[PDB]
Amino acid sequence: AANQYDNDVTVWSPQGRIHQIEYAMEAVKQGSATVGLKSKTHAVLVALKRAQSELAAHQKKILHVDNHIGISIAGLTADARLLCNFMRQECLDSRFVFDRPLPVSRLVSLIGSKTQIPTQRYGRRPYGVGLLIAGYDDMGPHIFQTCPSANYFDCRAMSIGARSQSARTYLERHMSEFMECNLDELVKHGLRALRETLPAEQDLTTKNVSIGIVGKDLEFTIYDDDDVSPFLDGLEER
Amino acid sequence: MEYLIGIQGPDYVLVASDRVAASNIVQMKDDHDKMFKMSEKILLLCVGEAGDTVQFAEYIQKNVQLYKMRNGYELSPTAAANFTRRNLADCLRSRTPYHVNLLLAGYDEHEGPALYYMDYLAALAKAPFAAHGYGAFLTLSILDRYYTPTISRERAVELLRKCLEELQKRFILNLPTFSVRVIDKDGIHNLENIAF
């Protein structure tokens, strides 16, 4: 009676809207904030980890999938782990058969065809998780937002999560010092992009910030609670 | 190459197995008792392939035991015999031929005692006395010479001792002990084991 578009990944709203796989995009707007970016040489990923408990590992976000194609989940976590067991397993399958590194574009395209099937058929929710995958193939280190609407983006310097639009509007007006700006001064430039999604009072502490580095002549490397402490600078007071 | 024997009396039927569990060259523990306890009054025996005796006939024991402790009364030995003939006969040609040949001693209350017999091809036939194994080939004429259609119990037991002492004398396998059970209208009894 009220909203007959509730039995609803088969239906269309009468304007153009599919009415819940954009609402899965709402379901990754609700998730925790993160930011990835790329240089001319190596792409980085930075994530703040929410602590909705006593204290925790704060539901560790950025994930090892790969052999240099790393991801950054936001949204649901079990569905994210299902999607990275898929992405993980067939990335290792391309290690098995072709014996080359699987290129990042075909990776993100075929998961963009794997999360697209339940959007199509009946009674099956979309994979409500916004990946922020990043890896270094033969050319420059790509970075792909993909979405629960199965529509990935070959982006550079993207931020997704809770109030991540402010991190984008910092990061949009600071693209000029990309394609330079080596690792020591790059990840500072990403953390001061992350340090706007916080509620205006809080340090990027060593607890909640977990980052990942991938690129030329280095494996996708996870920096946890201890290893993020050499990345320290700013005020921003933000 | 083992040995199963049975004699149908007027109101009973007695069976006896050879109490030897064999191997390649040696024999294992003697007892291993081949006579599988059915519900109360049925009692089947199984020789043949080492590995289908303990498997098939115990599965038949599961289904008949389930029939009794599912629907009150037990099976008559006719329906148990045709049941296991059906199950062996349709497990025969399909994928894994159960190479066992069964005796099935039993009696119903309101009919006589019955001793059913089948080969490894599950062809069933009643018999007043039946045998199995290679030891069947020499001992069966002694149950031809002396078996009246009406015989008392102790005469049938000492007749069975004639059959086992002949089987002890001529048959080349060391079968020193034999397990004997008389079943009759009070339930499954067990006669003293015959040894040498």
Partner: protein
């Protein structure tokens, strides 16, 4: 109505945020990771006194060195406790070693948000598992406990409360734990159960406590050990 695989005008799934409820329903369990073990306790809420209280299994040992503590909709966990122990002995079988706690917790939480109406063969699940639990276990990394959700979200925890006492007992546990075991975390956790008390002064008939210590494998406490502890409070 609407189905199970639909998102709610709040932002979440329907069946998941409904599976966060029926955890307030059910008994309360607590666990404390220490530096030399992890203690679990649950007040299993006996209804009548006409009866036998030592067969309400709410502390279940997955392996010798992983013990879980469920609550909520009880006996819905037995399929995923079965998957926990079958996956445990599969790991020991194929790899000839112990496990972590994030591998059993990794393996169980994959089964949480795995359901649906029209899918593969009808041995699948319809509703999500409405049971929140936490695996107290000791590893070669350290003793630790992993609090699961019905959403498949599992987190590192050192002091976590579930059940109906998920606010007052959690806030009390927030201010009383920092240091280490030294034998008194198990006596300052049933004290939190002593504040929780619903029906009876927490004797050795209505609470089940079990610790996992790195020297031993586990220890499901018997009656005289429990009432040895209750006498000290």
């Amino acid at each position: 109505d609407r189905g199970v695989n639909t998102f709610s005008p709040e932002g979440r799934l329907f069946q998941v945020e409904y599976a966060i409820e029926a955890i307030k329903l059910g008994s309360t369990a607590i666990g404390i990771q220490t530096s030399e073990g992890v203690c679990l306790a649950v007040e299993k809420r006996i209804t009548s006194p006409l009866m036998e209280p030592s067969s309400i299994e709410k502390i279940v040992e997955i392996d010798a060195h992983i013990g879980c503590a469920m609550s909520g909709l009880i006996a819905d966990a037995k399929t995923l406790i079965d998957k926990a122990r079958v996956e445990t002995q599969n790991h020991w079988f194929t790899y000839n070693e112990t496990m972590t706690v994030e591998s059993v917790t990794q393996a169980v939480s994959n089964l949480a948000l795995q359901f649906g109406e029209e899918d593969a063969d009808p041995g699948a699940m319809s509703r999500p598992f409405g049971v929140a639990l936490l695996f107290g276990g000791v590893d070669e990394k350290g003793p630790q406990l992993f609090h699961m959700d019905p959403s498949g979200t599992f987190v590192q925890c050192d002091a976590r409360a579930i059940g109906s006492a998920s606010e007052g007992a959690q806030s009390s546990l927030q201010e009383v734990y920092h240091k280490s075991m030294t034998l008194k975390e198990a006596i300052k956790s049933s004290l939190i159960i002593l504040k929780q008390v619903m029906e009876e002064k927490l004797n050795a008939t209505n609470i089940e406590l079990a610790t996992v210590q790195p020297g031993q494998n586990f220890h499901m406490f018997t009656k005289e050990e429990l009432e040895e502890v209750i006498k000290d409070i």
